[PDB]
């Protein structure tokens, strides 16, 4: 009970529905399911075709260019939970390029654990606005929906009356349904994790989404964490072992799994049947236990791997030594950084080089946690052990307080890094200790960090004069070592009722400094009474090709008028 | 007569007026005159000081930081003509940083032949708007006037009545004078070259500016071209020889000039006493004649010369072989190109490299006329035989129809060349024949030519539909080899009553091309009747790091409405 069917690990079906009868009886498929590329199908090829047995899928689900199909309500009436270990560009549901697919009817779907949903190029699909993803998913901001029949606003995706919850989200009540028949089920604000029953009572604390009886671990529908023999359990009691984050197996099971590659031979650690041990650990001929020892090399294919998503990431989960090179390239739009961090470089070494190209949303590099050493035994072409280009939000590389970096060979290469100011670049040169290598134009001295004044120098206001209609500031006249390079004073002002954060001024005559009576100012007229303003001033100076004198800026301050 | 004084070749006076009595008697100074750096002078040190004898100066005149002096009307009441062979950053008159200098009174100045006038940092000088430079100079657009007492508008620089010509130039009549006494003399519109006399009759056809009697070569004031013994002459009759573009000398003169370096030893060619012979020529022990022979190396100092003006240029006048390297660097603002052309590279070879850095107004390189060969035996650092950077108007390098180029070693290096499209760059690679050398980022593939769509591809309009209020164009759907790279259609339209020369359109669905019914269009509404318009369309596509498919543009066309 709770799963009368079988496992039937994931296999994918092509070109006709003949192999689909291999996947009839099974209750929960381990792995993934893809149905793709069936052109010669008919709508009649699905009315005699249904699978209520399938309830939960571990990893992901994909639909791609199968003709004649218009719905999914018959094929998968009872699919409920997607866990999403192996993802698909941080998705698990791929609804894509499906000609004639006009509805889904996936009402029994309740929770998708990890991943997102991408829907594209499906010019028949409607009923899409009636789908509250936030009930089913957490990060609704990673769901991409375009090129659909809804995108030319035609479909009256309604239900006859009350039933379907009309929930305000953005402007007004959004009726929530799947078909014109099937509503979207809403559990109350207390049965949220484990799900609710029909009348709305909470399920058992080990249920998930649906339960056949309220508060019963023997009468759930889907387990929250783990399954053991009619009871969803919080953990494995001995002598049982966790396997693939959903069940408890005995020693004999995962034991005899090892004996079949004679491919993922398995071992046991931390009461969990696992593929491999991390570093410092050992096999066991007795029981395949990760016993510690003295002294993990994830040797790539061709010493090189493009990394672009979680699907790229989890191949490097738990690695310690990378015998190759890495190309980080996320044409993205969404910060993967936490999920990026959670399966990345608990490492120190890279044998080859490192390359970061054209990635958009990488604001940092701190997800590299333990990284210390770059061997660089195979360089980037042009003799580089490191690279950067076109990183529209990258500001911090690391905090160099505790983070260290050791680089053997190669050079640095920075271009078009518009929020990466040169200060941390020279700091990275310093901590790297390879400052005697970089030639001219290894650093783009015109594009790096050219969207915020950064570096060191600070303006300080000497005198402040206010009125109801007058503002006069006085500040120390800064002069760079070439006093001709000063061009003028960039002043930035606005009002601010919060504190949560344009005129120009010619420089005065330097001429001396025993008594340089040259404290510059600007009179403001555009004042409102009793009104909080926000003003800060920046130094606008001449660019020079050499190590340019960085120029100053002032603090953002706050002034309230009469 | 015409020059009763002497020559007294140019020497410059410093720190007190003691050496000034060396330059009393002389009528026309050959060379240049600089007066500079006399702090401890008084205004009384000039009332007992005058030199009416000086009339014409060959090369240039410079005034720089001498105190106590307020005028020039007594020092040089009769200076009249500046010829300007050796110039000073394309100037011959340097009025600069003169404390207490409040007027000039240079009424007897009539024509400045070659060069310009720069006035700066003279916070006492006025009477400046009353000076028509176009009477005295040709290129008035090369005269830089700033930081003066006129720049804080105070001086009433007037004359009591009529006298001084009140000439409209820009808005109204500009009274023309030097002092409150001395008007600015205007000759009529027929005596313009040689000058006029007091009543306004034309002078002789060999006079210049002033003449003591109307139409008399024996009673001029200053020669137009050449001087010979009371008569300004068009040329030297035999046995006389031209010398420094102003006189005629016998064989004995320039003969005995050679005998004094035992520094510019002289020779004779083309009836002109000259410094040296050009290539293929020979000395003569008999008469120092440039006789032709079989088989000119201007060997630099340190193989290197910054070139920035005509003063830099004329050191390389007439050279044929440059045993060094050249750095072209004109922070400019004015096209020197014709004067640049007229004394430059009648050459073929450069032993070292070539470098062009940060020059502004160099639109071309065609002033390099005969240039063929770059040896490059000493490279630019980073292994380059060539360079470019920051050339805000450089578009054409050459016409490769007849112009050739041979490069031995080194590489090319292009950055920030915003009107230099890559087509001619690859053509220069082709003609150079050194295409198998340039690495990645030897060409900045993001900044070069990024201010005008250039390269090859051309849109063509198929169908045109008009009305009094409707404009519909049809044109051939271009598709780059990646059809996903097409993003949309940039359309540029405006009206044009002359013919002397903004909306966007999504791409349609490609899907095939037996019958690709995808001719794109745009309907216009903003039409005036009977009205000539000007429309052209550009292809807005995706950038790629590789050899990008260049994208197309349309012709500028002309459409008149109903």
């Amino acid at each position: 009970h709770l799963y009368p069917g079988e496992v039937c690990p994931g296999m994918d079906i092509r070109n006709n529905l003949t192999r689909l009868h291999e996947l009839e009886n099974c209750s929960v498929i381990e792995g993934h399911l893809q149905i793709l590329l069936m052109f010669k199908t008919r709508p009649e090829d699905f009315r005699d075709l249904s699978f209520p047995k399938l309830i939960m899928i571990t990893d992901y689900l994909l639909l791609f260019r199968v003709y004649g199909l218009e719905s999914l309500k018959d094929l998968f009436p009872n699919l409920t939970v997607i866990r999403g270990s192996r993802l698909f560009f941080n998705y698990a549901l791929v609804i894509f390029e499906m000609v004639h697919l006009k509805e889904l009817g996936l009402y029994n779907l309740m929770n998708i654990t990890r991943g997102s949903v991408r829907i594209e190029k499906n010019n028949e699909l409607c009923y899409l606005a009636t789908i509250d993803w936030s009930r089913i998913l957490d990060s609704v901001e990673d769901n991409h929906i375009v090129l659909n029949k809804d995108d030319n606003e035609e479909c009256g995706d309604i239900c006859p009356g009350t039933n379907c919850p009309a929930t305000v989200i953005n402007g007004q009540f959004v009726e929530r349904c799947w078909t014109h028949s099937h509503c979207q089920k809403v559990c109350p604000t207390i049965c949220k994790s484990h799900g609710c029953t029909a009348e709305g009572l909470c399920c058992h604390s080990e249920c998930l989404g649906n339960c056949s009886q309220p508060d019963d671990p023997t009468k759930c529908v889907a387990c929250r964490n783990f399954y053991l023999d009619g009871r969803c359990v919080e953990t494995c009691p001995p002598p049982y072992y966790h396997f693939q984050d959903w069940r408890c197996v005995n020693f004999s099971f995962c034991q005899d799994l090892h004996h079949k590659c004679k491919c993922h031979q398995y071992v046991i650690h931390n009461n969990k049947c696992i593929p491999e041990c991390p570093s410092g650990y050992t096999m066991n001929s007795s029981n395949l236990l990760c016993t510690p020892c003295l002294g993990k090399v994830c040797h790539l294919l061709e010493g090189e791997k493009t990394i672009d998503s979680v699907t790229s990431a989890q191949e490097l989960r738990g690695c310690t030594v990378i015998n190759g090179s890495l190309i980080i390239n996320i044409r993205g739009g969404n910060n993967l950084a936490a999920e990026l961090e959670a399966n990345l470089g608990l490492i120190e070494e890279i044998s080859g080089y490192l390359k970061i190209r054209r990635s958009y949303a990488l604001v940092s590099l701190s997800f590299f946690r333990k990284l210390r050493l770059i061997r660089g035994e195979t360089l980037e072409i042009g003799n580089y052990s490191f690279y950067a280009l076109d990183n529209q939000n990258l500001r911090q590389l690391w905090d160099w307080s505790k983070h260290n970096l050791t680089i053997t060979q190669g050079k640095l290469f920075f271009h078009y890094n518009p929020k990466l100011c040169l200060s941390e670049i020279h700091k990275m040169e310093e901590v790297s200790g390879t400052k005697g290598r970089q030639e001219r134009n290894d650093i783009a001295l015109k594009t790096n960090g050219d969207q915020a004044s950064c570096e060191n120098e600070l303006l300080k206001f000497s005198y402040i004069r206010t009125s109801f209609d007058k503002i006069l500031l006085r500040w120390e006249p800064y002069w760079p070592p070439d006093f001709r390079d000063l061009l003028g004073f960039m002043l930035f002002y606005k009002e601010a009722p919060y504190q949560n954060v344009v005129v120009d001024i010619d420089p005065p005559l330097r001429s001396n400094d025993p008594k340089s009576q040259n404290h510059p100012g600007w009179l403001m007229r555009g004042l409102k009474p009793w009104t909080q303003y926000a003003i800060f001033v920046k130094t606008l100076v001449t660019f020079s090709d050499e190590r340019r004198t960085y120029g100053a800026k002032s603090d953002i301050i706050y002034v309230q008028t009469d | 007569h015409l020059y009763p004084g002497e020559v007294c070749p140019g020497m410059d006076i410093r720190n007190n007026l003691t050496r000034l009595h060396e330059l009393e008697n002389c009528s026309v100074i050959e060379g240049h005159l600089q007066i500079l750096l006399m702090f401890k002078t008084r205004p009384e040190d000039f009332r007992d000081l005058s030199f009416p004898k000086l009339i014409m100066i060959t090369d240039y005149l410079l005034l720089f930081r001498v105190y106590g002096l307020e005028s020039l009307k007594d020092l040089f009441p009769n200076l009249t003509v500046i010829r300007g062979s050796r110039l000073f950053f394309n100037y011959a008159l340097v009025i600069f940083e003169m404390v207490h200098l409040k007027e000039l009174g240079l009424y007897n100045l009539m024509n400045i032949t070659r060069g310009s006038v720069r006035i700066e940092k003279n916070n006492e000088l006025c009477y400046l708007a009353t000076i028509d430079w176009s009477r005295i100079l040709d290129s008035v657009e090369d005269n830089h006037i700033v930081l003066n007492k006129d720049d804080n508008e105070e001086c009433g620089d007037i004359c009591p009545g009529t006298n001084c010509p009140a000439t409209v130039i820009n808005g109204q009549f500009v009274e023309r004078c030097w002092t409150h006494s001395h008007c600015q003399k205007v000759c009529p519109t027929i005596c313009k070259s040689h000058g006029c006399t007091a009543e306004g009759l034309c002078c002789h056809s060999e006079c210049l500016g002033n003449c003591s009697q109307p139409d008399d070569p024996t009673k001029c004031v200053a020669c137009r071209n050449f001087y010979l013994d009371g008569r300004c002459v068009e040329t030297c009759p035999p046995p006389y020889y031209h010398f420094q573009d102003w006189r005629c000398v016998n064989f004995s003169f320039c003969q005995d000039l050679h005998h004094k370096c035992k520094c510019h030893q002289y020779v004779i060619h083309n009836n002109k006493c000259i410094p040296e012979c050009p290539s293929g020529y020979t000395m003569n022990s008999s008469n120092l004649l440039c006789t032709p022979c079989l088989g000119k190396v201007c060997h630099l100092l340190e193989g290197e010369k910054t070139i920035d003006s005509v003063t830099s240029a004329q050191e390389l006048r007439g050279c044929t072989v440059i045993n060094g390297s050249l750095i072209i660097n004109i922070r400019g603002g004015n096209n020197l190109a014709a004067e640049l052309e007229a004394n430059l590279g009648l050459i073929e070879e450069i032993s070292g490299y070539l470098k062009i850095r940060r020059s502004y107004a160099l639109v071309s390189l065609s002033f390099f006329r005969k240039l063929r060969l770059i040896r490059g035996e000493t490279l630019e650092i980073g292994n380059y035989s060539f360079y470019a950077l920051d050339n805000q108007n450089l578009r054409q390098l050459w016409d490769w129809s007849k112009h050739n180029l041979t490069i031995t070693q080194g590489k090319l290096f292009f950055h920030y060349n915003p009107k230099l499209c890559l087509s001619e760059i690859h053509k220069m690679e082709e003609v150079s024949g050194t295409k198998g050398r340039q690495e990645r980022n030897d060409i900045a593939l993001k900044t070069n030519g990024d201010q005008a769509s250039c390269e090859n591809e051309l849109l063509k309009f198929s169908y045109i539909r008009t009305s009094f209020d409707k404009i519909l164009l049809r044109w051939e759907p271009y598709w780059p080899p990646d059809f996903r790279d097409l993003l949309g259609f940039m359309l540029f339209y405006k009206e044009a009553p002359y013919q002397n020369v903004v909306v966007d359109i999504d791409p349609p669905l490609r899907s095939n091309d037996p019958k690709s019914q995808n001719h794109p269009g745009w309907l216009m509404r903003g039409l005036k009747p009977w009205t000539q318009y000007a429309i052209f369309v550009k292809t807005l596509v995706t950038f790629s790091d590789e050899r990008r498919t260049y994208g197309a543009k349309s012709d500028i066309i002309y459409v008149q409405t109903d």
């Binding site: 092509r14 | 990646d482 059809f483």
Partner: peptide
């Protein structure tokens, strides 16, 4: 036979026109 760079549904239709019958299996290991 076209001599042209291909992506997207153009490439999909080209692949379908080449394959026709069975064309492509999914046994990398089993």
């Amino acid at each position: 036979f076209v001599n042209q760079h291909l992506c997207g549904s153009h490439l999909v239709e080209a692949l379908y026109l080449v394959c026709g019958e069975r064309g492509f299996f999914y046994t990398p290991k089993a």
